[PDB]
Each structure stands twice: as C-alpha cells, then as structure tokens.
Design a protein around this ligand. Structure first.
Ligand code: HEM
Ligand code: HEM
Ligand code: 342
Ligand code: 342
Lengths: 298, 298
C-alpha cells in the first residue's frame, strides 16, 4: 500500500519555487479545465502571470473565484465527508487580508452568525491568510469553533486537555457541564489570544418529562489546513450541519435546527443540482499547535 | 544474581484481576506520590474508581495525564538510555482509540512529521491501544520506524531477514543500498499490512571530495512494549536523536540535524530543568511478532 499522509505539518521557510511552480500550474489547469473548451487564452494568460508573480515575490495570490473553486473541490475531495455530495452549497468568506487576532475574532463571529442563521444552518468556510515562510501562520487552536469545556469528568471529556490549556492561558473556568470554550486565536505567528464567544452567537438545542441536557447546533471544524496549487492555508474554519431514546432528532426538528434527515438530504442536493446551467485541493489535518508553538512569552 | 527478564511476551487471556489490581494500585500511588503532600483525596478517589472499573470490565483506562507520566517514568527507568537524563522533554501522542492499520499508519506519519521537525529533532512517543485479551494486539513489526532494507549484502545487513519478510508480504524490492523499508502494521491482532512511508517524510543527512553515502536523521524504536500499572502497550513507537574520518558530526551539524553534541546536551538538559516550578513503568523488549503470529491468511 502507498497511502499518503493526511497531515500537513509546519514549515520554517517558504516553499521552494521549484516545488511551488509545478503545483501552481497544475491547479490553474484544473481550474481552467472546469470551463471545458472555453477560455484557452485566459488560461495561458493566467499561467504567465502566476509564473511571473512567483518568480518576483516567491509566491502568488489566488483570484477570489479560484479560491472559491478550491474550497469546493477540497470538499468534493474529502473522503469521509457525507456532505460533499452537495459540494456547491458553500459560502466563502475571504479573510486573506486579515492581520490581527482581534480581526480573526470578528471574522469568526461573522461566520458563526451567517452559518447559524437562527437554526436554518448554512455551510460556510472562512479563509485566512496563506502561509508565507511558516513563521507567521494564522491558526485556530480550537478543534471546533463551538465545543463544551472538559474538566472523573465534567463537560466534554474530549477537551479536558484543551480546557486545561485555556485555563493556563488566563481563561476563567466556570465549572458547568456546558461551558462554551473560548476561541484561541493565533495571528501572524504570534502567541494565541483568548476570546470568549458572545453567548448570543451560540445556538443550542434543548432536549425534550428535566436532566438539563442541551447541545450546540453548529458543528464547525476549526483546525484543518487547505492546500491548493502548492499554497497552504493553515487557518480556514468551515461548518456543515449534523447527521443525527434519541430525543435529538426530535429536539432538533422541533426547534427547527437543520440536520441531515431525508428532507434536508433531498433539498440540499436539489439546490446543489440547480447550481448547474495525491488529491489537490485538499483539507489536511495539522499537528496540534500547542505542541509546536514557540512561545515569545509564556 | 536475580536479574529480571527484559522481555515481555504474548498472552492468550486477559490479565487476572488478582494480578492486575495490585499493580494498578501501586502505579496510582506512584502517580499521586508525584504530588507529595497534595491530593490525598483525589488519590483515594482514583483508587476507588479504578478498582471498580477493573471489577466491572476486567481492566481499566489511564487518564491522559497518567499516561503521560507513565511514558516519562518508563524513559527515566530505561537503564541504557543516555537521553533519559532529560526525560521531561517528551511529546506524547494518544492513539489509544486507534482501531485499524490505516489509522495506525496516519498516526505514525504524524509522529514522523512532528519528531523530524525539518531536522530540529523532537522526542515523541505514540501510544496505541493497550493489550486486552492478547489476541487483539496492535504491533509494529519493524524494529525502527525508518530503516534501510537489507538484501554478500546490499543495504542494511541487519535487516536482511525483515526485508525478506516484507517481500514475502508483497512489498516490491527496489534493490538499492538505501531503500527505506515499509511500515508493517498489525491492528487488533489482524495480519499485518504493508505501508510505504511517504519519501518526503524521510529526512536524510547526505555525507560531505562522491561515494553516494547518506543516512536517515530520525532514530525511532518501533517494537517495544510499555508496561504500566499492570497494563501492557505492545505498540508504542518512540524516538530520540543520534548520539554520534567521521563526516557524520560534520554532515549532521552542517545540515542542522540534531545530534547529542555538548550544545544539544546542555540545551536539552536546560529545557528539561526548566520543566520544574522490578521497575515499573518500563519499556520491555518483545518476541519478534512474525515468530509468534497466527496467520488468518498466508
Ligand atoms: C453540509 C453538511 C455537511 C455534512 C452533513 C457533513 C458531514 C460530515 C461527516 C459525517 C464527516 C465525518 C466525521 C467523522 O468521521 O468523525 C465529515 C468529515 C469532514 N467534512 Fe463534512 N459535512 C458537511 C459539510 C462540510 C463542509 C462545508 C466542508 C468543507 C468545505 C466539509 C469538510 C469535511 C472534511 C474535510 C472532513 C474530513 C473528511 C476526511 O477526513 O475524509 N464538510 N463531514
Ligand atoms: C532524546 C534523545 C535520546 C537519546 C540521545 C537516546 C539515546 C539512547 C542510547 C544511546 C541508547 C542505547 C542504544 C544501544 O545500547 O544500542 C538508548 C536506548 C533506549 N532508549 Fe533512548 N535516547 C533518546 C530518547 C529516548 C526516548 C524518547 C525514549 C523513550 C520515551 C527512549 C527509550 C530508550 C529505551 C527504552 C532504550 C533501551 C534501554 C535499555 O534497554 O536499557 N530513548 N537510547
Ligand atoms: C462538517 C462539520 N464536520 C464536523 C464537525 C464537528 C466534528 O466534531 C467531532 C467531535 C465532536 C462531536 N462531533 C459530532 C458530529 C458528528 C457528525 C457530524 C458532525 C458532528 O458535524 C457534521 O456531521 C464530531 C467533526 C466533524 C464535518 N464536516
Ligand atoms: C531513542 C532511539 N533509540 C534507538 C534508535 C535506533 C536504534 O537502532 C539501533 C540499530 C540501528 C542503528 N542504530 C544506531 C544508533 C546509535 C545510537 C543512537 C541511536 C541510533 O538513536 C539514539 O542513539 C542503533 C537503537 C536505539 C534509543 N532511544
């Protein structure tokens, strides 16, 4: 067997141009190939401009449309994702001009608001600045945007470690069982900063003859890396909606929070279908950033 | 003399509870003893929960922090390991929820990536699921994660046998002198599967007035067993870095691959020291798994 690694690690230097250029060219082809017989000239013109940009600057920037295409193809290329059948249903927020953690936070608020949509969940991805030399990475340290803390256990037992990290970073732990962990955000390679998510941004389905059980509506992956044309985006949170004695199906449907039931299955595929008139791009796992981060202040 | 065996063999049944419980209790004590006067109540509470878990399930699970502690104490307890002086410098990857060989492979890729760190080597251990009844063991059949094949001789003369085994398993032997052997991975007691290591994951120091000599940067023991509190982890690869007419010291230092020179000696001990504000646990040798494995398909 010759499987590839599903993980893409840190760098300490820019991608060598001799490595980057072939990848850039291949993606450009894939992109312009999505127009079949049309646009031969734009294709070649783009090849020339990208090549020059790389030779001049050591890298290149994607057009907005190229980025949108990339995020959708990466989704289409996600082997385990059930949602990828309707891969055209994806809203893209372009945050590649982001520079600070405060700005990252505002972008994520915007994302959570749009995708939550008061229960009528919409898929979205927010793309932060691409890796340059690898010493200025933007990363979200959370595994998901919204997750309950973990503290025997109290809360989300799978975040006991991350919860402890937040505390160590100055987060004040309320010790409930449904404490929404803060966003831990790294901009430009700096030490991460801690941001409470505004409670009003977090939609929860309350389960329904008293246990006080509830769960958050928005499942959002915070910690993967988008690869495209040799470029790496170490910060690119995205979300879908849930797949699904189970008062869940009932509580979600009764509170009208989207889940992947047959109706939603048919509808989303219907909408996807109406949007018509080594794998790359790809979402990679990363090494947990607290295991690799060099603190400029601990 | 009353030396103990440094080898821990296979089982065909779960550890008897009457054997397991005393060992579990002893480790819990060792763990909570590392807090001196504090935490008497957590200690007793943990004793009670572990005892109940064993009586209920026939075994028990370590907390993440208990596991981390165990791996570091086992290292501290390794008589021949020079690196154990700086035993607090160890990154632990928890793969105890692993179930398939493909998953094992992804964990090992992640390990190789982190520990290699583009030449700035970091110590790490990846811990796979603990032995249950002994008929579902996870094992790596390699002695190291990265090793050259052996084929008079061609390649690593010490792997002639293992190389032959890989071939017998379906591996196609390129007949060079520096062929990186594939990972041979056994999950849940199943027959092993063969996985080429992605070449880009393998860092090599090229020796430097033409012989074409090179060697791999990452020394990683693949085949030992971690014992702790009566639990056995037959799959727990770990790595350090090398100790060191010798163009080696030069080639490694000049290509900035870590070795245990005086500088690295002082630095790593310095970092270890800043991490402050029958032996058990222990790493055992095992019997070569191809000598004991019952093929459900040959
Ligand atoms: C529209 C609703 C969506 C549904 C129902 C859905 C469902 C799933 C499910 C069930 C998994 C597997 C979880 C596991 O194995 O533990 C998954 C994985 C994943 N999803 Fe989604 N997803 C959706 C939207 C998205 C979006 C918008 C993206 C990206 C733009 C995406 C990217 C991925 C990726 C990369 C993985 C990992 C896939 C792999 O490793 O093979 N998903 N998704
Ligand atoms: C940080 C760099 C490290 C260095 C320089 C180092 C060096 C060594 C050396 C020189 C040996 C003896 C080899 C021989 O006799 O053929 C050894 C053995 C060993 N090392 Fe390391 N090591 C390091 C990290 C580790 C780590 C991370 C672990 C485990 C978490 C570890 C566990 C062991 C074990 C169990 C043995 C066998 C010891 C025995 O049988 O007495 N080493 N190491
Ligand atoms: C879109 C969103 N996702 C995920 C979101 C959140 C994820 O977190 C995992 C760990 C916490 C519990 N999560 C439960 C879950 C299960 C199935 C599912 C989820 C979340 O979102 C889409 O479909 C799984 C995993 C995957 C995948 N695509
Ligand atoms: C960490 C890593 N190790 C080892 C890694 C690899 C090992 O393989 C042996 C057989 C192949 C050649 N190896 C050479 C060697 C020598 C000294 C050393 C090595 C490898 O890694 C740490 O220090 C020894 C043995 C021990 C021990 N601690």
């Amino acid at each position: 067997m010759n499987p590839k690694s599903l993980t893409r690690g840190p760098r300490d230097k820019p991608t060598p141009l001799e490595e980057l250029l072939p990848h850039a060219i291949e993606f450009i082809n894939q992109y312009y190939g999505s127009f079949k017989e049309a646009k031969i000239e734009e294709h070649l013109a783009r090849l020339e401009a990208v090549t020059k940009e790389i030779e001049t600057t050591g890298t290149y920037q994607l057009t907005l449309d190229e980025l949108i295409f990339a995020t959708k193809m990466a989704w289409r290329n996600a082997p385990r994702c059930i949602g990828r059948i309707q891969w055209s249903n994806l809203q893209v927020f372009d945050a590649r001009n982001c520079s600070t953690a405060q700005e990252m936070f505002q972008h994520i608020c915007r994302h959570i608001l749009y995708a939550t949509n008061n229960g009528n969940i919409r898929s979205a991805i927010t793309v932060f600045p691409q890796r340059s030399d690898g010493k200025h990475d933007f990363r979200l340290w959370n595994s998901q945007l919204i997750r309950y803390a973990g503290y025997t256990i109290r809360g989300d037992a799978a975040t006991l470690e991350f919860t402890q990290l937040c505390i160590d970073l100055g987060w004040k732990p309320r010790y409930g069982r449904f404490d929404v962990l803060p966003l831990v955000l790294q901009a430009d390679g700096q030490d991460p900063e801690v941001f409470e998510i505004p409670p009003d941004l977090v939609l929860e389905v309350t389960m329904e003859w008293e246990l006080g059980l509830k769960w958050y509506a928005l499942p959002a992956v915070a910690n993967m890396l988008l690869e495209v044309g040799g470029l790496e985006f170490p910060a690119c949170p995205f979300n879908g909606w849930y797949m699904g004695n189970v008062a869940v199906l009932h509580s979600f449907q009764k509170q009208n929070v989207t889940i992947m039931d047959h109706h939603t299955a048919s509808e989303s595929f219907m909408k996807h279908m109406q949007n018509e008139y080594v794998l790359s791009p790809f979402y990679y796992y990363q090494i947990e950033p607290w295991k690799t981060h060099i603190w400029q202040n601990e």
